[PDB]
Scaffold this active site. Sequence first.
Site, PDB file in Angstrom:
ATOM      1  N   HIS A 136       0.842  -1.195   0.000  1.00 14.47           N
ATOM      2  CA  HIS A 136       0.000   0.000   0.000  1.00 14.47           C
ATOM      3  C   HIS A 136       0.878   1.246   0.000  1.00 14.47           C
ATOM      4  O   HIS A 136       1.955   1.259   0.607  1.00 14.47           O
ATOM      5  CB  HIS A 136      -0.870   0.098   1.271  1.00 14.47           C
ATOM      6  CG  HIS A 136      -1.774  -1.075   1.499  1.00 14.47           C
ATOM      7  ND1 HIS A 136      -1.341  -2.247   2.088  1.00 14.47           N
ATOM      8  CD2 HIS A 136      -3.100  -1.242   1.240  1.00 14.47           C
ATOM      9  CE1 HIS A 136      -2.362  -3.086   2.171  1.00 14.47           C
ATOM     10  NE2 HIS A 136      -3.429  -2.520   1.636  1.00 14.47           N
TER      11      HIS A 136
ATOM     12  N   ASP B 142       2.170   1.893   3.441  1.00  9.69           N
ATOM     13  CA  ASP B 142       3.179   1.011   4.011  1.00  9.69           C
ATOM     14  C   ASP B 142       4.572   1.549   3.718  1.00  9.69           C
ATOM     15  O   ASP B 142       5.509   1.318   4.478  1.00  9.69           O
ATOM     16  CB  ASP B 142       3.104  -0.384   3.391  1.00  9.69           C
ATOM     17  CG  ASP B 142       1.794  -1.085   3.637  1.00  9.69           C
ATOM     18  OD1 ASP B 142       1.160  -0.875   4.694  1.00  9.69           O
ATOM     19  OD2 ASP B 142       1.436  -1.856   2.742  1.00  9.69           O
TER      20      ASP B 142
ATOM     21  N   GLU C 204     -10.694  -6.636  -5.151  1.00  9.74           N
ATOM     22  CA  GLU C 204     -10.577  -7.706  -4.148  1.00  9.74           C
ATOM     23  C   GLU C 204     -11.852  -7.697  -3.325  1.00  9.74           C
ATOM     24  O   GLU C 204     -12.068  -6.733  -2.574  1.00  9.74           O
ATOM     25  CB  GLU C 204      -9.376  -7.463  -3.228  1.00  9.74           C
ATOM     26  CG  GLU C 204      -9.241  -8.535  -2.163  1.00  9.74           C
ATOM     27  CD  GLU C 204      -7.970  -8.394  -1.395  1.00  9.74           C
ATOM     28  OE1 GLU C 204      -7.126  -7.570  -1.784  1.00  9.74           O
ATOM     29  OE2 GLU C 204      -7.813  -9.137  -0.422  1.00  9.74           O
TER      30      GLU C 204
ATOM     31  N   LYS D 292     -14.625  -8.820  -0.361  1.00  9.68           N
ATOM     32  CA  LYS D 292     -14.645  -9.350   1.004  1.00  9.68           C
ATOM     33  C   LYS D 292     -16.067  -9.146   1.492  1.00  9.68           C
ATOM     34  O   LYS D 292     -16.641  -8.089   1.198  1.00  9.68           O
ATOM     35  CB  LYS D 292     -13.667  -8.576   1.892  1.00  9.68           C
ATOM     36  CG  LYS D 292     -13.531  -9.185   3.301  1.00  9.68           C
ATOM     37  CD  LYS D 292     -12.566  -8.382   4.185  1.00  9.68           C
ATOM     38  CE  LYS D 292     -12.294  -9.164   5.475  1.00  9.68           C
ATOM     39  NZ  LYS D 292     -11.490  -8.343   6.449  1.00  9.68           N
TER      40      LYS D 292
ATOM     41  N   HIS E 162     -11.488 -14.823   2.245  1.00  7.24           N
ATOM     42  CA  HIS E 162     -12.649 -13.948   2.126  1.00  7.24           C
ATOM     43  C   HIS E 162     -13.843 -14.702   1.592  1.00  7.24           C
ATOM     44  O   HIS E 162     -14.957 -14.545   2.099  1.00  7.24           O
ATOM     45  CB  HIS E 162     -12.354 -12.748   1.234  1.00  7.24           C
ATOM     46  CG  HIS E 162     -11.371 -11.829   1.878  1.00  7.24           C
ATOM     47  ND1 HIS E 162     -10.871 -10.710   1.252  1.00  7.24           N
ATOM     48  CD2 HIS E 162     -10.722 -11.931   3.073  1.00  7.24           C
ATOM     49  CE1 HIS E 162      -9.962 -10.150   2.054  1.00  7.24           C
ATOM     50  NE2 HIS E 162      -9.877 -10.851   3.171  1.00  7.24           N
TER      51      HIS E 162
ATOM     52  N   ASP F 210      -4.881 -13.749  -3.838  1.00  7.61           N
ATOM     53  CA  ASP F 210      -4.329 -13.631  -2.493  1.00  7.61           C
ATOM     54  C   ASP F 210      -4.470 -14.984  -1.808  1.00  7.61           C
ATOM     55  O   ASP F 210      -5.586 -15.474  -1.651  1.00  7.61           O
ATOM     56  CB  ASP F 210      -5.085 -12.604  -1.643  1.00  7.61           C
ATOM     57  CG  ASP F 210      -4.575 -11.185  -1.791  1.00  7.61           C
ATOM     58  OD1 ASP F 210      -3.723 -10.894  -2.658  1.00  7.61           O
ATOM     59  OD2 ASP F 210      -5.117 -10.324  -1.080  1.00  7.61           O
TER      60      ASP F 210
ATOM     61  N   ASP G   1     -11.732 -12.476   9.799  1.00  8.50           N
ATOM     62  CA  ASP G   1     -10.721 -12.766   8.763  1.00  8.50           C
ATOM     63  C   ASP G   1      -9.413 -13.120   9.458  1.00  8.50           C
ATOM     64  O   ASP G   1      -8.759 -12.253  10.042  1.00  8.50           O
ATOM     65  CB  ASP G   1     -10.622 -11.504   7.883  1.00  8.50           C
ATOM     66  CG  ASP G   1      -9.624 -11.613   6.674  1.00  8.50           C
ATOM     67  OD1 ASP G   1      -9.543 -12.652   5.995  1.00  8.50           O
ATOM     68  OD2 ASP G   1      -8.985 -10.592   6.376  1.00  8.50           O
TER      69      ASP G   1
ATOM     70  N   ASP H   2      -1.344 -13.040   1.294  1.00 10.04           N
ATOM     71  CA  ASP H   2      -1.868 -11.968   2.125  1.00 10.04           C
ATOM     72  C   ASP H   2      -2.187 -12.646   3.453  1.00 10.04           C
ATOM     73  O   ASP H   2      -3.263 -13.211   3.613  1.00 10.04           O
ATOM     74  CB  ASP H   2      -3.101 -11.375   1.489  1.00 10.04           C
ATOM     75  CG  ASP H   2      -3.634 -10.192   2.268  1.00 10.04           C
ATOM     76  OD1 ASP H   2      -3.027  -9.846   3.301  1.00 10.04           O
ATOM     77  OD2 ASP H   2      -4.648  -9.612   1.839  1.00 10.04           O
TER      78      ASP H   2
HETATM   79 MG    MG Z   1      -6.184  -9.605   0.581  1.00 10.90          MG
HETATM   80 MG    MG Z   2      -8.161 -11.458   4.744  1.00  5.15          MG
END
Ligand code: MG
Ligand code: MG
Lengths: 386, 386, 386, 386
Positions: free
Chosen positions: D53, D56, D180, D182, D219, D244, D254, D286
């Site tokens: 990211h 990060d 992505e 979730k 996820h 991931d 998670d 991940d």
């Molecule tokens: Mg992920």
């Molecule tokens: Mg996760």
Amino acid sequence: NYQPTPEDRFTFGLWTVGWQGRDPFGDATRRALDPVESVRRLAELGAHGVTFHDDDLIPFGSSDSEREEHVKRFRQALDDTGMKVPMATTNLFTHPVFKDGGFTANDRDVRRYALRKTIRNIDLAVELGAETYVAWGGREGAESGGAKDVRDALDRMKEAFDLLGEYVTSQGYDIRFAIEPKPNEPRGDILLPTVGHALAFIERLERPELYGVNPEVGHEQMAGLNFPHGIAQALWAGKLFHIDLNGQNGIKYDQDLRFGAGDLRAAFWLVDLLESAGYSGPRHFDFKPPRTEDFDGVWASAAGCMRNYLILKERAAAFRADPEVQEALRASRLDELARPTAADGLQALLDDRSAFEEFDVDAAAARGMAFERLDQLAMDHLLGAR
Amino acid sequence: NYQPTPEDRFTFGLWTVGWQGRDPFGDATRRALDPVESVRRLAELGAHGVTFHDDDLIPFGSSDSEREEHVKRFRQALDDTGMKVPMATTNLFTHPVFKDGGFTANDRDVRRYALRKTIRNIDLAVELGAETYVAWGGREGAESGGAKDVRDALDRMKEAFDLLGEYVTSQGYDIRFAIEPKPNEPRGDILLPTVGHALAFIERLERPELYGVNPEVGHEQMAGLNFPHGIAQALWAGKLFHIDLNGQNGIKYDQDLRFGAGDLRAAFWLVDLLESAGYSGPRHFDFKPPRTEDFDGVWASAAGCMRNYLILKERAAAFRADPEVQEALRASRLDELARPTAADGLQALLDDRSAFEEFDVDAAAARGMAFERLDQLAMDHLLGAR
Amino acid sequence: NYQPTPEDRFTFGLWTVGWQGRDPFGDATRRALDPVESVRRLAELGAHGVTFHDDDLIPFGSSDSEREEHVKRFRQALDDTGMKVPMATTNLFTHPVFKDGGFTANDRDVRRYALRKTIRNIDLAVELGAETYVAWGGREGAESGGAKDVRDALDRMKEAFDLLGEYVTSQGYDIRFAIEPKPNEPRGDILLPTVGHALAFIERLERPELYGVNPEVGHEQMAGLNFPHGIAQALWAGKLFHIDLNGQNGIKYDQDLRFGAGDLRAAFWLVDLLESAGYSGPRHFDFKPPRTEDFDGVWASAAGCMRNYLILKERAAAFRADPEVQEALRASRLDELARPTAADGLQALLDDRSAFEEFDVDAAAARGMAFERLDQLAMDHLLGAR
Amino acid sequence: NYQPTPEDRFTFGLWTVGWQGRDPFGDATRRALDPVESVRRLAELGAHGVTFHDDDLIPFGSSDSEREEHVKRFRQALDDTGMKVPMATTNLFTHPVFKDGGFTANDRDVRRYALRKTIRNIDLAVELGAETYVAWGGREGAESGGAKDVRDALDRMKEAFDLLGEYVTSQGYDIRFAIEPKPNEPRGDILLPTVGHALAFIERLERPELYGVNPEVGHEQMAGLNFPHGIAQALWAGKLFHIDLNGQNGIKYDQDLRFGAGDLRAAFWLVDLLESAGYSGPRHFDFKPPRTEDFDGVWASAAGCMRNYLILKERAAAFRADPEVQEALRASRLDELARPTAADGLQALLDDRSAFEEFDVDAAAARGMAFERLDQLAMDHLLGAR
Ligand SMILES: [Mg+2]
Ligand SMILES: [Mg+2]
Ligand SMILES: [Mg+2]
Ligand SMILES: [Mg+2]
Ligand SMILES: [Mg+2]
Ligand SMILES: [Mg+2]
Ligand SMILES: [Mg+2]
Ligand SMILES: [Mg+2]
């Protein structure tokens, strides 16, 4: 119009309205609240009292001198407002030393430390007038199968609770313990994950009469279980010492929504049960105002907890008082469920040919239970359509 | 190569390999199996024994004369094969009369009938040599909140089990009872939904020593719970009288897959626990060959149950015997978990300044638990990469 | 008082009130209903119409002669009552030949048979006036990973739907298709398990405009998903052709409770959305009166479906019309959500220093969303406390 | 022995091994890692590359001058080690300003800020050589029903992705986007909650060819869905741009366990699919080393991710190459699933009496699918018992 008073016995944790909104993916959205200002605002809303972890009230690491000053200020706000402290508990989960548990950590020195930290707060709780001391073993558990021999861990858990029971009885304290189950989070699986597992464990303690449960709505729903059924079993066993009220939308992370949110019909049946069984302990809200909210939303959320309890109490009372519902309950044979199956005894049952040899199994099978009409009357009452 | 023998104590219900494949949306895909031919085929596969519901063996409605002939034929196949009958149970769920339950039906006459039907089969079970009598209360529960007052229902459930305990003790039978929990299906919520709730309930019976649990892998997983943890608590309490082995993929309808399917790592930790605790009861498979299969697939599925148990037993034994794993267990302080927290007693703990005043909380917190290395050694053993 | 009329467009499957109560563990508790008597009783309750599988109306295996007589009798009851038939569907799940699927069975001859069986019923549906033809692929899926190559199965599923689309267009029929997702049961995992997966699949068909979705409340809740959110995405895409209304208590077997049971607040938000988006299709109930009930309970349960829809419609309308709620919606910036983020375009956004270089991130972060006050107003409206 | 090399294309997020162990109930247990030291340690373990990211790599609030120095140091460690950066993403979830979302926040100025923050990082990603830009909308969603009109929110989500697509095409960048999904956490429900919902949404964007999905094992399992099935549908659509990899034990918070933990058999079928479909993108982990671990456990956990992938790859390859499995696949008619149902066309199908009028439905129904034997061969291969 659904206004709470201290006689409704609504209580809140300091950590609830004081939650700053840090979640696993985000920083705090609200500043820290002084415990004194939480006590004042909750008293204005009609709360009866507050609860605390040791570390909510006394910052971890405080000297005995700062500790006394924190307690004095708190004590003064209680005197100023009339608020009570019916329950207290220990934080055995935030500090990194508890990363593998407190009472069941693999390291023996951590387990000893966990016990001393608990005993220190039991003394303070008694001094503030608490009647119940809650234990939530949030770090007791594991993410992997080889990390924790669960039989040894249950031995260590029993050892810790037995020692706490020896401590309170030798000090002459009038306080009882309540274990709060949770199935998971923050550990992958938590020991004593449901009301049932906690009730069973208590029966193996040396002085079982000192221990009960503190079930939480959302925690049993994280296992997909029926929370009013679990409370009924705890009342049946005589072990419902305290309760944590909040809301949860199904099987996911612990949301701690305000009470009435989440599963609304389960909230209705819960209130019906607590009021009809005459539960007289605190109605405690363990909830988190969502981190979307500012401080005005915090107090609105807290007020909503109490409001929804009082609305559901009114609807459940109207349901049970309705002659048409009383008729429907007899139509569904709830009266017969309450009568003994065989008060005449085993031998009479064995000799009773109407129970087997001459029992008309097809005629009994044809009888409808009329449960759907009964449940629609309950829906109509909940929605105010009656 | 992973060949079972009767000494492995693998057992199967008649209803497992005999499942015809009727599900809520579809007709049977297989013809009915004669119990005699199931006994013969299971003995050829290496099974130790079979279990039955009353209605699997004796068609519901049979006259005493047809009943004797059904038992004689069954008895002869047992003698011919050497198969044992270690467990039996009652069908209190298929017939429409049980639509609202057996022991906790709202109608009192149904509850009496349920008890007489059970007692009749206990006599037969004892005559066939069964040591455990299982009760699965699949219809005890509710779809709606007003249909069942759960405290009254638990009174009726206790009354029924107390009467059964009075019956066996007055007859002098050497048989024990095991309650099989399930959280839901076919009722919306079932009473005593988990191992924990069943263990707690047993402690309120008049003769608790007669009663234990019969947990089933898939049932605890329908609540998202850790099945090896629940078994550990049942062993800790001395109550693991019997076990139902199968597989389940998560929280959904009860799949009853063959053992080893579903959550494979949980199956590994389960076998590790049962073998390391010296569980000596039957390894019973309560599974359903999927309705995609013909009879050849039925026997392949049954064989797979036993095969997967024996493979996992070998891998778990290799894991525990590996010096590198024994080293890792000490690195993770499993040895310290097994040592008492405070065998020196309460007063010594209170006086021990190394437990609190001088405890170095930052140094303890910095210690890694080394759980990930331990869990990868377990993975390597499971996969045969060690 | 919440009385339905045919203008409310409430419809029921023949298989709903006609469910005999066979579940995986129990025999039927009710006798079979003649479709003609279901049509008559539903019309008396205020329904608009009925739906059917081919095999609900014409017993599987019927000769063309018996088929004509079954349709004529049905047609006469429709004429007598004024009931419509807005939707029909095919049973590709009950007969054993469909044990591994219909359109995606591994055996090619079964797939061809499945298509011919479907096409035969499309002709009948058009003749009875249906506008929507539903496909629920309940057997399309797998219990184990190697049994089904999912890419090949999706090729076969696309092939089947493409052929059905070629058939209707070459016949000149005015009928559209709606795919009904379900995540599992009776297969371990079902292909196209959610609204999202079905919407994505439709976009790969040759004539996507012919296909939409038929979501069912309980099915999305079996995956723990938010059903009003999923409906919103289907409306956004222009694909909500039909809807199945019922109730479900969380992640477990498909309960098919009457609408309003299960997650009541989700039912409120669903009705709010359907009415505020002007959904004009049938309000179809795919529900099962519990097998505890006799025929009086069947009709009470069906009536309750419609009643709860109308109560929630009234409460949702009162919520949206309340000036205090309209104020709260602006307080929470729902009006700003409806305005474009950057109608000024990309280059203007890139040049706008108030969007980044001079954006006051701390002042924006401090703004509360006021969502809890808004949600308590919604609760008060739902409960009739406003 | 299962040693990774950069040719295996294993990649890790900076935020994975760098997770300090803060969870909702506890403080950090590990100190922060310098990104340069993560790059070095991962290269020693055999990784191919890292992802980040924006926040990060560049602390939020950095001046352009500190920003350049952070990128230069990072760039130097990449040159020193040979590590690549195949993917980057934006943090639109940690800062309090994103408490109600980034692209779908109700406040318009926050949405504009979210877009500018994203565009700034796309430029940096392209400069570092990333080919995929991931978007995880972790704050896009709601805890209550009235807070978010989902149709308006999907309009805002489409607007944001359309603008990003206009930006990359007008700059001439060779980068693609991957969404992505979730289902929940940290919001009560997240928009686009599964692979399916994301695939459907992409088809409504202005330039759909620029967008694919980045599914994550855990996820989809938080919704109880079959992750290999979802990946198969993404490959079928041509949209699997990135993946991931991690582990998850069922429906709960998670967990982000190391890959191979959680559902092991699903991991086996996932690897089988990715390798047999020739997926050539990064194998990205991940995951979060549990907070029980010190830094030695962090690197052991990361190494375990790669090890378990390579073991499963070997077992899946042995499975597919085994002549006995190839025979079993034909026994179960996987070859017939891959053949068209009706390449002869609609009219030929309608005229083919062997497809319906003369189809022997009882003979087809009697054929077993032999799926259980096939699945036991897969189990034997996974466990190394073949
Ligand atoms: Mg992920
Ligand atoms: Mg996760
Ligand atoms: Mg909670
Ligand atoms: Mg709590
Ligand atoms: Mg089962
Ligand atoms: Mg069982
Ligand atoms: Mg359904
Ligand atoms: Mg449906």
